[PDB]
Design a protein around this ligand. Sequence first.
Ligand code: ZN
Lengths: 131, 58, 69, 115, 304, 171, 64, 446, 98
Amino acid sequence: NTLFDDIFQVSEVDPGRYNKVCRIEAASTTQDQCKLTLDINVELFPVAAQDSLTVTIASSLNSWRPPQAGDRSLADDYDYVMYGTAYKFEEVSKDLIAVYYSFGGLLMRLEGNYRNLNNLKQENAYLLIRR
Amino acid sequence: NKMSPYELVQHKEESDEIGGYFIVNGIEKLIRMLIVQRRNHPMAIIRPSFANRGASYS
Amino acid sequence: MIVPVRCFSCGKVVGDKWESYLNLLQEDELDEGTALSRLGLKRYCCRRMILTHVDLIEKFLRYNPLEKR
Amino acid sequence: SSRHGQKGVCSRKWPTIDMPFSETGIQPDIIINPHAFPSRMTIGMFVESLAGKAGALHGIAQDSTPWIFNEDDTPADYFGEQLAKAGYNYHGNEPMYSGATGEELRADIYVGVVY
Amino acid sequence: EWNVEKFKKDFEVNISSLDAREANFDLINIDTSIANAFRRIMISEVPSVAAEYVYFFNNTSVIQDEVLAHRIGLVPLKVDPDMLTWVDSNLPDDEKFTDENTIVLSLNVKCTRNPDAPKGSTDPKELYNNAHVYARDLKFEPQGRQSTTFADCPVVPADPDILLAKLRPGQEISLKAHCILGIGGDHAKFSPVSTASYRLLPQINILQPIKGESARRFQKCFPPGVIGIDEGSDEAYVKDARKDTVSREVLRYEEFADKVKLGRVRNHFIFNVESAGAMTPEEIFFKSVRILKNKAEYLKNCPI
Amino acid sequence: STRGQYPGLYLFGGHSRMLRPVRYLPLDKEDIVGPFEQVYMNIAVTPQEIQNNVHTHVEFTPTNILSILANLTPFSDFNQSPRNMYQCQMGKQTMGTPGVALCHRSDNKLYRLQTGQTPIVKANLYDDYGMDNFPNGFNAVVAVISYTGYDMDDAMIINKSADERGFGYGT
Amino acid sequence: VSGKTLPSFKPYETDAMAGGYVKGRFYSGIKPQEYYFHCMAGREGLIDTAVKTSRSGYLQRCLT
Amino acid sequence: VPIPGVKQALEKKEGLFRKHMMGKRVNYAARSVISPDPNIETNEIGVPPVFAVKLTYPEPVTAYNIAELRQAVINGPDKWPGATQIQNEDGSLVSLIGMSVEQRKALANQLLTPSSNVSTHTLNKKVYRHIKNRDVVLMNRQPTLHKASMMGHKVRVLPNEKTLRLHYANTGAYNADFDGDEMNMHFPQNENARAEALNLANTDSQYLTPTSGSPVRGLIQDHISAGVWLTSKDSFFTREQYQQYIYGCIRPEDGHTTRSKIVTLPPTIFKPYPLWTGKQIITTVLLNVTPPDMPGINLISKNKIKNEYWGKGSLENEVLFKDGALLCGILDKSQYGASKYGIVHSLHEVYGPEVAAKVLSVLGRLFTNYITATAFTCGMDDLRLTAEGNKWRTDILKTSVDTGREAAAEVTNLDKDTPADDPELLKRLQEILRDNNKSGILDAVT
Amino acid sequence: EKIKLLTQATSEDGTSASFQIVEEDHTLGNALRYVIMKNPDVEFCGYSIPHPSENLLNIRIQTYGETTAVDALQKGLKDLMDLCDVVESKFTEKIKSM
RNA sequence: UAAAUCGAGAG
Ligand SMILES: [Zn+2]
């Protein structure tokens, strides 16, 4: 089931001496407190500055196995799906929680109000990107 | 000594055989050049071992 | 000593192209590159086979124990 | 050994099908690790590989007596222009493919002709 | 669902040239695993014929016997490998060689001075008789029934101008060479391919239009038949990507550093097979694919 | 000089002196100089570095300060000096060509390279000493690549097929 | 004795290059004077390497 | 010059105490030039067939042994594994060298025949069998400065060449290159010395040097750059590549893994198509080598490459293993290699020495197979500077045209800007040169 | 004894197995590995050379159930044979034209 | 079958 949903405006895309991955800084359009930095390989899911991305963190998609015909998942509604682990939590200040996810080495930092991010635990999670 | 390269080849030696070495018991030897003091020039020497040549020795 | 039968790197037979190479350099006033190209040696692995051969065997052959001089 | 003090013993006679092969079809007869140069600083071997490939391609011989080049006319520029006028790249690299997997290697491979 | 039918529908061969010593063809929509297997089997596994053993009776020349035998083993013989079987190592050296698996060559050349040599001559052809020994001097001696089955195509070196040795008067070479069936993975002399290799098809992607004089500069950075200026408008296009090596000279200029990408069509291989002489490259490739198929079949039919 | 070497004019013409040819800048001719004579005059290493009123000689080439072996290494001014010394050490230990009259020698031990080659990259002095009469090594296609895993510390890989074709064979 | 670091340098020349400062690099090569100074340094390094090994065995022997 | 006496035979080196008592020459020892060999278990030594034919061990024949010893006697002295001699109970030494196969079968069928003599009824025969793959060997390279320069390796016999093949990790302690370096293999001839070399002189026990507790084992040259490339963020591997890389080093038939089935990980990227990561390759390598019924490793460390070398906002300088999974950072020399508080050091401290050795072997094989498919090269392009870099270098070096003169003016106590040919400056420079102490400060200031 | 099953790796179920083949290299191994990785039932497939100097190859095959590893190996061998057969047929057809 | 001394090398 879903743990987090939002829409982010991408401000910058810095390649950082990588030919496939990029670091994306994005600010939420609904809550001013929600910001997100995320490493994504732009070889598969290319992005640009001033791009609106629908970002969803989920607990599952309802071991691993390559998909067969007629496989139902929550990944169908999104374009770019990564799988990762949360490893760090911090408090920027009162009423501000920053959670750190690692998707096989690709880092994501998600900062937002603790009530919006209360569904996030220290567990495996799927990050889904649309548009 | 003054054999041409053709004559050197005719006498089994080499096309461009060079000398400078003796043959002793079938083994080729040479006498290495040494470095020695320059001849006929008095050079000032400050050597501690001179003091070891005896007492009252600078 | 004598020209190799084959190029080391790839294995192309180049032992049949030494007298031809010398004749191409000798009669026709050619440079080494054009003469090698005319012989069909494209890759530099084959080109340095005939370009850099020294052909020392001739110098060996003048010392003949089996014939008087 | 080479003429730059890069001595070393043979480890395995690599079968030719397992050696990397270039876009021209050739495979090297010598593999020397790139991790021998950084601490030894034998750049003469790099420039000799460059000059050897250029000379073998053009069918000429290049003189390598010291102090004929300057800091203005670097030998890399000279032999790179010679290589570029023959088709090969300026820096002496060649696109090679691994003889085991068969896929192209990550980057171009530095290969030339050395004594 | 990958299937042999889908590959059969997508695979395609595009022959660019065909000769008696070289075949340059193309394989499209095939994985580099199978293409590399074909390349390796061509180089190392398709059998050929070369002089394996050498029996010397006299070598008074300036070349040692081991080097001479090595050279005689390194000369390709123009004999179709199908005409002889395989020898047995476990068989004794008496009966190991038969008329069905071994071809006998003989070399008996004795040098002698030419008395009629022109005065003041230095050429070793006017001076001596049989001064140079060539591969064409390797006489073939058919023994047994091979005197009949080889009558239509006698054994003769593929390159007869190979210079085996040079002689001087009094010096002579008399020897026999037994040539057997062998593969290139045992010794490099049995490899029938002078060189077998594929290359990925270069791919020049013009990201942004290079219209104008710069196109001439862009055309200059590739071999001539690769980049062409459009006839209608001054603009560059990829005329033929097979005619450029991946030299990346365009990458050395900041003018086009951001206006082009170089890649490969990583399922499109250009195979260039140059043969040694005993077989045609088309038959070499056919034998390679047949060898892979038979290897898989033998593995499949063996009890586990 | 103030507490320097003992002053005076000395003339030497005897045996066993060490002499080298420099270029006397006046008259643009050849002069012969010795170690004692050299430590007080200024010889420019190249005519482009001549200075007015302070240089009286130049060297015909800066490569005549080196020996034969030190002059036979290609692009010597690009390597590290220990590597040049190591090369001078190992140029005397190769399995090259000792001579062509080997049939009449009776030496205790001899190493011979069957097929040597002239270098593509060589100094001009290589031809002046007739080193082609005595080949030393072979031109080799060398890939500077970390691919095999069997050559990391100082080892190297040799093609098996090239070895079977006579690459580096010796007696 | 004359105050020259090399035959090609005037006596008591106030230059970094005269004293042994190599501005060249192994990529573009070094000048003959810089070559000579670098040879001095390399020879000193080899001499130290040879003399260091002989200078340490006796200490370990005595301790052991 | 005169004839040495009894005293002269004992006193100094080359005497009798230092040359024939404290140091002796030994039997059952070989010496050879080493060559590198991956695919060797980092605790093994690869021995040539010649050494495998000459070196032998006396195995007393027993009830559990006749299966192998009989075949060893049959194989003879020139077919590894084989036997070269038989020692009867009475001490007879029957040599198997000059014997035919039929005689060898007759002798082999009489190995475990009970003795007919009462005096030796407590004894059994011994077969001087060839060195095998289960034997241990003492490897030493001179000079033996420290004890780690003489270790014990498990023997693996190779079929091809006359060199002792050694893993790269052993080069740290032996200080050994492959520049024609040679070393000595010793074959202990009893079980007491077998257990010592397998437990006390064991090369697994020698991970940390006793000098300061720092490790002296790890991958050296190609594997470090291989892991820098493999653990980068750009490293994405398809399912076939990922699984082939995993099986290329954790073969579950040589005891390389624990679970009897190679367990993999879900891909980092699910859509558009499944991709794994190099850090995930490291993670699954550790997961397969680490024993089950035990938590994963947890390490927060650093590597040698600053975050500024990966672009803005990168955190790849800090290595983070969590629950046995690599989640950040690059594996480097400081992680695998003779370096403290790396991943290999932590695995040694937590899982024991054998696991650390196994991890070293697996990582060596993994990086070897990654370099054979993704090659590494250095060339002339790497040594160049840009036009602006050369301009900066020339501009800075042009400012050095007055450094020496200013240093001399400082030492000579002239004020400044004094021309290089100032007669007072020349006089004082000459005075400075003639002194070994003043010119010692001139050469230090400049 | 051309191809052998390693009992220290095979499972009693039969889904996981290791095969050792004599006289093979990264020529049959790579092609067979790719062709059997095409199988949707195969979970894990890999090939490994224990030592380069020994003519030994290992193939590890683990399935998802419903099919043994031996059956997967058989399917891979047959598919490799068919692949070689179709490339041979295409080459023969193209030879006739030009 | 041995021993010194000299010389040349390798790490
Ligand atoms: Zn070639």
